[PDB]
Design a protein around this motif. Structure first.
Motif, PDB file in Angstrom:
ATOM      1  N   UNK A 115      91.992   9.196   7.585  1.00 54.41           N
ATOM      2  CA  UNK A 115      91.012   8.209   7.148  1.00 54.41           C
ATOM      3  C   UNK A 115      89.689   8.883   6.795  1.00 54.41           C
ATOM      4  N   UNK A 170      74.921  -1.125  -2.915  1.00 54.70           N
ATOM      5  CA  UNK A 170      76.178  -1.772  -2.558  1.00 54.70           C
ATOM      6  C   UNK A 170      77.138  -0.781  -1.904  1.00 54.70           C
ATOM      7  N   UNK A 174      78.577  -0.801   1.992  1.00 50.91           N
ATOM      8  CA  UNK A 174      80.030  -0.767   2.089  1.00 50.91           C
ATOM      9  C   UNK A 174      80.513   0.449   2.875  1.00 50.91           C
ATOM     10  N   UNK A 177      79.668   0.136   6.561  1.00 51.13           N
ATOM     11  CA  UNK A 177      80.620  -0.763   7.200  1.00 51.13           C
ATOM     12  C   UNK A 177      81.940  -0.065   7.506  1.00 51.13           C
ATOM     13  N   UNK A 178      82.452   0.686   6.534  1.00 45.45           N
ATOM     14  CA  UNK A 178      83.715   1.400   6.698  1.00 45.45           C
ATOM     15  C   UNK A 178      83.646   2.394   7.854  1.00 45.45           C
ATOM     16  N   UNK A 181      83.518   0.423  11.307  1.00 49.80           N
ATOM     17  CA  UNK A 181      84.803  -0.187  11.634  1.00 49.80           C
ATOM     18  C   UNK A 181      85.782   0.862  12.149  1.00 49.80           C
TER      19      UNK A 181
ATOM     20  N   UNK B 139      87.050  -9.834   9.604  1.00 46.83           N
ATOM     21  CA  UNK B 139      87.078  -8.380   9.653  1.00 46.83           C
ATOM     22  C   UNK B 139      88.003  -7.899  10.772  1.00 46.83           C
ATOM     23  N   UNK B 143      90.992  -5.417  10.052  1.00 53.01           N
ATOM     24  CA  UNK B 143      90.670  -4.039  10.423  1.00 53.01           C
ATOM     25  C   UNK B 143      91.394  -3.503  11.658  1.00 53.01           C
ATOM     26  N   UNK B 162      91.223  -2.666   2.548  1.00 52.64           N
ATOM     27  CA  UNK B 162      89.902  -2.053   2.517  1.00 52.64           C
ATOM     28  C   UNK B 162      89.017  -2.645   1.423  1.00 52.64           C
ATOM     29  N   UNK B 166      85.552  -4.576   2.044  1.00 54.06           N
ATOM     30  CA  UNK B 166      84.370  -4.288   1.234  1.00 54.06           C
ATOM     31  C   UNK B 166      83.710  -5.573   0.750  1.00 54.06           C
ATOM     32  N   UNK B 169      82.013  -7.374   3.589  1.00 56.36           N
ATOM     33  CA  UNK B 169      80.772  -6.647   3.826  1.00 56.36           C
ATOM     34  C   UNK B 169      79.694  -7.099   2.844  1.00 56.36           C
ATOM     35  N   UNK B 170      80.070  -7.218   1.573  1.00 58.47           N
ATOM     36  CA  UNK B 170      79.157  -7.699   0.540  1.00 58.47           C
ATOM     37  C   UNK B 170      78.690  -9.115   0.852  1.00 58.47           C
ATOM     38  N   UNK B 173      76.033  -9.014   3.754  1.00 61.84           N
ATOM     39  CA  UNK B 173      74.740  -8.592   3.226  1.00 61.84           C
ATOM     40  C   UNK B 173      74.079  -9.728   2.454  1.00 61.84           C
TER      41      UNK B 173
END
Ligand code: A1AEA
Ligand code: A1AEA
Lengths: 213, 230
Positions: A115, A170, A174, A177-178, A181, B139, B143, B162, B166, B169-170, B173
């Motif tokens: 990952x 953006x 993003x 967040x990835x 998580x 999520x 996840x 994923x 994303x 997540x957008x 925000x």
């Protein structure tokens, strides 16, 4: 805490612990290696900006809850460039069948490494993630408030790094967040790791390593 | 993925499962009530999951696997959300309100209650909003199990998962921006919210560990059967 984002990164980079070697059955090696890395983790933690502002009691508590997670993300980070393989040490590189209840944990560690590889995790990023684990794992009034301020500061730093890399706003949110998580999975692996053990470093041992004033 | 942020929130708000009740009419009853309640919420959870954007795009077996991994997390974040405005108490149901000492009656249950109560306290001091909660729950669903699936089909699923993450997540925000937060405050709150998921994972594992010390998880085919509609 008044440090700039750039100063925060460099401080954390300078604070990075060394790569250790395995003293050499397989369970004894992994146990002994983990025991030796623990000392360097403690000395790493002391250099994480804002950490030594906490009471020793709370420093120990954070380490008690974070130590295996930190071992694991460290293992995963240096295993990135070695697909299907776990680089515990330069002279101890294992695959999943060398894990044969360790294979499941090995598998999870291997997936996390892939990952990171896929995400092209940068050194400046990993080092922030490790700091977040340290401060976030055990936090569940003035002290918790301090911990969250430091966490917020590291968030800023992570966002700054991504901005420097040219990522759009953006992409910044993003990617942030990835990364966070992923910490959920590392938490999960640590839990299963602690389960597959039942051992843990005592309060006194950790406090001793902290080498108080 | 054609959904806007506003359309994402709307779909998640409409997918919300109902608040269920405990039976109407003891400390020896507690675990039975908590078990019965969990089993009944599971049914509505599967329906909810199906209405999470992108979820039914996945293969049925990957859907089962995501639910196997996240079902207790989803139960717990729902409980923690319900209990947010009830300090010191866990609102399992509007007629089932428990505190620490009632947890004491069962071995190792007070520790789990404490963690759940502490999470509720965290949501409280963050003033967690309903639109944020449903994003966080989504999520968790997508996840929690994705890192424990290499087949070509599976690689395609993960990329899809994923990309939905994303988008959520957008959406998070976006919601924080409309609320009037600064950019710095937006990333900071996004981080704070996502870090709580680590602790919810933690609680699910501790709780899962309890259950094996006493049907304890949903079986594959049980989840299959509820998911595999005709
Ligand atoms: C007395 C102080 C506590 N020590 C006893 C020792 O217990 C352990 C025994 C095995 C493990 C291994 C291990 N060792 C590592 C060394 C460097 C970086 C990563 C690791 C890991 C992760 C993983 C393989 N650990 C096994 C486990 C805990 C069942 F998941 C981790 C801890 C920690
Ligand atoms: C198909 C078999 C699986 N079901 C049997 C059932 O087992 C459980 C028995 C008790 C619990 C409780 C519980 N019940 C809830 C009802 C609605 C929302 C939250 C909950 C929780 C969380 C928590 C208190 N659970 C106890 C425990 C041991 C931590 F899982 C969770 C699961 C789930």
């Amino acid at each position: 805490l008044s440090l700039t984002a750039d100063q925060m990164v460099s401080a954390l980079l300078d604070a990075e612990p060394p790569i250790l070697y395995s003293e050499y059955s397989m369970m004894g090696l992994l146990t002994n290696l983990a025991d030796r890395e623990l000392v360097h983790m403690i000395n790493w933690a002391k250099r994480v900006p804002g950490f030594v502002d906490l009471t020793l009691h709370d420093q120990v508590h954070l380490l008690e809850s974070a130590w295996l997670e930190i071992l694991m993300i460290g293992l995963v980070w240096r295993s990135m460039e070695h697909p299907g393989k776990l680089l515990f040490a330069p002279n101890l590189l294992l695959d999943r069948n060398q894990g044969k209840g360790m294979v499941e944990i090995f598998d999870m560690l291997l997936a996390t490494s892939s990952r990171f590889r896929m995400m092209n995790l940068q050194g400046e990023e990993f080092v922030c993630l490790k700091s977040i684990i340290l401060l976030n794992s055990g936090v569940y009034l003035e002290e918790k408030d301090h911990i969250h301020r430091v966490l917020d500061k590291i968030t800023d730093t992570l966002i700054h790094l991504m901005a420097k890399a040219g990522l759009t706003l953006q992409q910044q949110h993003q990617r942030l967040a990835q990364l966070l998580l992923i910490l959920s999975h590392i938490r999960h692996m640590s839990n299963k790791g602690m389960e597959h053990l039942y051992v843990v470093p005592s309060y006194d041992l950790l406090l001793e390593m902290l080498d108080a004033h």
